[PDB]
């Protein structure tokens, strides 16, 4: 009977609906503090980049909760956050399963593919724009010089150690880091053919050395990534011609 509603026993249920709405917010701030690489050293860089877009969503929550005075009653605030109530319930339990790194990057692209939502689509589009920033950074250094950059990442590392005595393919063993399943996922082109050819043009760039839709913007990055691999492939055809 403590307060419960000046209107009899109504706040006893309405305040639980917004405390449960308040319950999901302290999970997102709990998740953001535990994955930072100043308090942990076992999470991936793509796992860190998903949080970097999440923390920009946290200050939008903080700027909106600071503007709710002066409140009239408990309906005027919960109905303002009724649209925001659907969003926070989505935005917390997508990661809570436990996907990590490229699989977490695979969970978020599917969730950005789930339109018929029009306020949940651009925030996950923005999370796809931020979480793909370390992965796309590892793309252009690999196709223009061939340097592998991450010391600790979700993407598996191969050494590509070449014997000096045998010239076999300048590498003498590579295998694959995704050895047989080859499941490069969820980035532009969908990483089903061009992932096999950013492989081989990445093999040959260092052979030069030492002698409205989430799919449409995906398709806009796709053909430039088809254009530059064919541009690096037409250099190694000329390098085979001259040597």
């Amino acid at each position: 009977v403590y307060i419960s509603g000046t209107s009899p026993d109504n706040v006893s249920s309405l305040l639980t609906q917004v405390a449960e709405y308040g319950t999901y917010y302290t999970r997102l701030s709990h998740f953001s503090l535990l994955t930072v690489l100043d308090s942990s050293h076992s999470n991936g860089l793509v796992f860190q980049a998903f949080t970097s877009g999440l923390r920009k969503y946290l200050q939008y929550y903080r700027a909106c909760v600071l503007s709710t005075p002066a409140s009239l009653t408990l309906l005027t605030i919960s109905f303002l956050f009724r649209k925001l109530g659907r969003q926070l319930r989505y935005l917390a339990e997508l990661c809570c399963a436990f996907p990590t790194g490229v699989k977490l990057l695979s969970y978020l692209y599917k969730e950005a593919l789930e339109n018929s939502s029009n306020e949940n689509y651009p925030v996950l589009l923005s999370l796809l724009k931020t979480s793909c920033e370390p992965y796309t950074r590892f793309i252009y250094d690999w196709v223009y010089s061939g340097v592998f950059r991450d010391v600790c990442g979700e993407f598996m590392i191969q050494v590509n150690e070449d014997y000096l005595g045998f010239r076999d393919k300048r590498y003498w063993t590579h295998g694959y880091v995704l050895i047989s399943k080859e499941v490069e996922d969820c980035v532009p082109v969908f990483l089903k053919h061009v992932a096999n050819e950013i492989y081989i043009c990445g093999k040959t760039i260092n052979l030069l050395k030492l002698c409205s839709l989430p799919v449409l913007m995906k398709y806009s990055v796709t053909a430039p990534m088809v254009s530059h691999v064919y541009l690096v492939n037409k250099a190694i055809v000329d390098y085979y011609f001259v040597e």
């Binding site: 409205s212 913007m217 430039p224 254009s227 530059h228 541009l231 000329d238």
Partner: peptide, 29 residues
């Protein structure tokens, strides 16, 4: 040899203008 490589980097310069046009289309959306 160098004349064939001059047209290859010229196509990369056209791709760089296409990447700036795609960034302007992302700013308009």
């Amino acid at each position: 040899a160098a004349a064939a490589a001059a047209a290859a980097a010229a196509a990369a310069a056209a791709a760089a203008a296409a990447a700036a046009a795609a960034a302007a289309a992302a700013a308009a959306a």
